[PDB]
């Protein structure tokens, strides 16, 4: 599924991501925009052999099991395929664990490089929240 901007903002708020660990909804929407362009099915292989999965491009090295990332952990205790659902619940549950890990949203390199420090409020501008 390819979410619309306000549609994703609504889903993210419903699942309690809005201001989770202090990160306003626009941060989460911005991270999703640049991680996956809002596409729940996005996958991208990393040169280390891990793969990133879903709307928030959660990595198999640490967070989910894809059965092909040797020596990896599955800290969210989920198949990475679960992170490709049109329903964002598994992605949100895992993101909450990731962002609580100690480095906040810096764990998302696209958020650090493209969202951090920016007017992230723009991402929810106009949305009925």
The catalytic site residues sit at: 35, 52
Options 6-14, 26-34, 54-62, 112-120: segment touching Pt ion (CB under 5 A): 6-14
> Collapsing DSSP states into helix, strand and coil, what is residue 80?
helix
Q: Which is nearer to Na ion, 40 or 65 (CB)?
A: 65
61 is an interface residue for Br ion by CB under 5 A: no
What is the rounded CA–CA span in Å between residue 8 and residue 68?
30
What is the rounded CA–CA span in Å between residue 54 and residue 8?
13
Decide which of Br ion, Pt ion, Na ion, none touches 74; Cβ closer than 5 to 8 Å per partner kind.
Na ion
Element (DSSP H or E) covering residue 27: helix 25-36
Q: Which is nearer to Pt ion, 87 or 101 (CB)?
A: 87
Residues within the interface to Na ion (CB under 5 A): 60, 65, 69, 72, 74
């Amino acid at each position: 599924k390819v979410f619309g901007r306000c549609e994703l903002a609504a889903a993210m708020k419903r699942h309690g991501l809005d201001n989770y660990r202090g990160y306003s909804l626009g941060n989460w929407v911005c991270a999703a925009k640049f991680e996956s362009n809002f596409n729940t099915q996005a996958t991208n292989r990393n040169t280390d052999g891990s793969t990133d999965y879903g709307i928030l491009q959660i990595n198999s090295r640490w967070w989910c099991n894809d059965g092909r990332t040797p020596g990896s952990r599955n800290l969210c205790n989920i198949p990475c395929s679960a992170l490709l659902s049109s329903d964002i619940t598994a992605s949100v549950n895992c993101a909450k664990k990731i962002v609580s890990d100690g480095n906040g949203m810096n764990a998302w390199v696209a958020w650090r490089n493209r969202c951090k420090g920016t007017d992230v409020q723009a991402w929810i501008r106009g949305c009925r929240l």
